[PDB]
């Protein structure tokens, strides 16, 4: 039961922090996703943090541009959008992805989501 918030309208080259939060739960017992759906394509993986082995992983095409994170609470996963671009435009979503695992598409998603648009 994961929440998303923190979308909005940004410029090409602008930052957002999305928050992904089981309020007060504690999330760093699960390894978690961000994933997100842009139209006409299909739902993708964006970043997933593996609790369980202290790790993070990235799309190619958001790499070094996006990070993942906690910060001390425990209970909310942040993540920190830099130089954005239009490919960016979709709506975010978070879910556990046990291990985070590259192969798999389906998740339980519990969240409305944030929708983030990036444009001039």
């Known amino acids: 039961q994961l929440v998303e918030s923190g979308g909005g309208l940004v410029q090409p080259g602008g930052s957002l922090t999305l928050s992904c939060t089981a309020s007060?739960?504690?999330?760093?017992?699960?390894?978690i996703g961000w994933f997100r759906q842009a139209p006409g394509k299909e739902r993708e993986g964006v970043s997933c943090?593996?609790?369980?082995?202290?790790?993070?992983y990235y799309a190619d095409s958001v790499k070094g541009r996006f990070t993942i994170f906690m910060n001390n609470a425990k209970d909310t996963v942040y993540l920190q959008m830099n130089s954005l671009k239009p490919e960016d435009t979709a709506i975010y979503y978070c879910?556990?992805?046990?291990?985070?695992?590259?192969?798999?598409?389906?998740?339980?998603?519990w969240g409305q989501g944030t929708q983030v648009t990036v444009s001039s």
């Open positions: 879910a556990e992805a046990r291990g985070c695992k590259r192969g798999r598409y389906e998740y339980d998603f």
């Open positions: 007060g739960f504690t999330l760093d017992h699960y390894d």
């Open positions: 943090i593996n609790n369980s082995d202290d790790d993070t």
